Enzyme design. Structure first.
Site, PDB file in Angstrom:
ATOM      1  N   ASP A  64       0.959  -1.159   0.071  1.00  0.00           N
ATOM      2  CA  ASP A  64       0.038  -0.029   0.070  1.00  0.00           C
ATOM      3  C   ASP A  64       0.941   1.201   0.069  1.00  0.00           C
ATOM      4  O   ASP A  64       1.414   1.750   1.040  1.00  0.00           O
ATOM      5  CB  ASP A  64      -0.950  -0.141   1.164  1.00  0.00           C
ATOM      6  CG  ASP A  64      -1.998   0.944   1.214  1.00  0.00           C
ATOM      7  OD1 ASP A  64      -1.670   2.105   0.485  1.00  0.00           O
ATOM      8  OD2 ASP A  64      -3.114   0.798   1.548  1.00  0.00           O
ATOM      9  N   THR A  65       1.004   1.705  -1.175  1.00  0.00           N
ATOM     10  CA  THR A  65       1.892   2.939  -1.125  1.00  0.00           C
ATOM     11  C   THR A  65       1.040   4.325  -0.754  1.00  0.00           C
ATOM     12  O   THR A  65       1.742   5.264  -0.561  1.00  0.00           O
ATOM     13  CB  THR A  65       2.355   3.422  -2.715  1.00  0.00           C
ATOM     14  OG1 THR A  65       0.824   3.533  -3.372  1.00  0.00           O
ATOM     15  CG2 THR A  65       2.845   2.219  -3.187  1.00  0.00           C
ATOM     16  N   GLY A  66      -0.277   4.175  -0.339  1.00  0.00           N
ATOM     17  CA  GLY A  66      -0.953   5.219  -0.049  1.00  0.00           C
ATOM     18  C   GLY A  66      -0.742   5.369   1.711  1.00  0.00           C
ATOM     19  O   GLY A  66      -1.080   6.204   2.127  1.00  0.00           O
TER      20      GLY A  66
END
Ligand SMILES: NC(=O)c1ccc(S(=O)(=O)N(Cc2ccccc2)[C@H]2CNC[C@@H]2N(Cc2ccccc2)S(=O)(=O)c2ccc(C(N)=O)cc2)cc1
Ligand SMILES: [Cl-]
Ligand SMILES: [Cl-]
Ligand SMILES: [Cl-]
EC number: 3.4.23.16
Lengths: 99, 99
Positions: free
Chosen positions: B25-27
């Site tokens: 999850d890059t968020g």
């Protein structure tokens, strides 16, 4: 590009003629932008976030550019912590995770 | 690996002797896992996003193996609906976004 993750992967998007900053979020299935005007009809959509599910507005077949890469697809509008480009449009622009 | 975003980028991790499934999850600034025991000191934190905030316990300097890659970093533990590998550990395995 190749975007490292030491900082938030915030990029410029263009939608409805306007530049906005948005987060590339591989944990988001969808693309959810802050309250804005989009054309057409919308349909209801529930998105499940960290604190639970909320109702947002779903607009389909919306032109949006992501770091200059043209996309056309579903854009949700609602009270997101930040504009988010999720996997529906990340896939469209050919984005992958690599290590 | 090169991981497509057609589906959620789910991987197996090993943490605290447990094998879990987690989302790359890059968020997410930090890694957030469902309730589990971890060694050492912790301090409370609140994290949030769509649907609101949850309270988590912040453990630092925790060893996680992600796809055979060892990485050390903070792990937030709390009632998250999904196990998340956030940027704090994605960086450590050299994970990038590419398009
Ligand atoms: N502060 C920190 O470290 C931190 C904060 C927050 C979290 S998080 O748990 O919430 N988390 C993981 C997650 C949660 C639930 C399901 C899948 C993944 C966020 C990162 N990726 C998506 C999450 N969200 C976006 C977001 C939140 C906060 C900051 C930046 C981006 S969101 O608003 O839940 C959302 C959900 C789903 C959709 C969708 N369907 O598109 C869009 C938006 C982790 C860590
Ligand atoms: Cl509605
Ligand atoms: Cl779409
Ligand atoms: Cl860390």
């Amino acid at each position: 590009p190749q975007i490292t993750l030491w900082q938030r992967p915030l990029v410029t998007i263009k939608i409805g003629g306007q530049l906005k900053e948005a987060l590339l979020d591989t944990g988001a299935d969808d693309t959810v932008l802050e309250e804005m005007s989009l054309p057409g009809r919308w349909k209801p959509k529930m998105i499940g976030g960290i604190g639970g599910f909320i109702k947002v507005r779903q607009y389909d077949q919306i032109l949006i550019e992501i770091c200059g890469h043209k996309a056309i697809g579903t854009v949700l509008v609602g009270p997101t912590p930040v504009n988010i480009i999720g996997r529906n449009l990340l896939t469209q622009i050919g984005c992958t995770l690599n290590f």
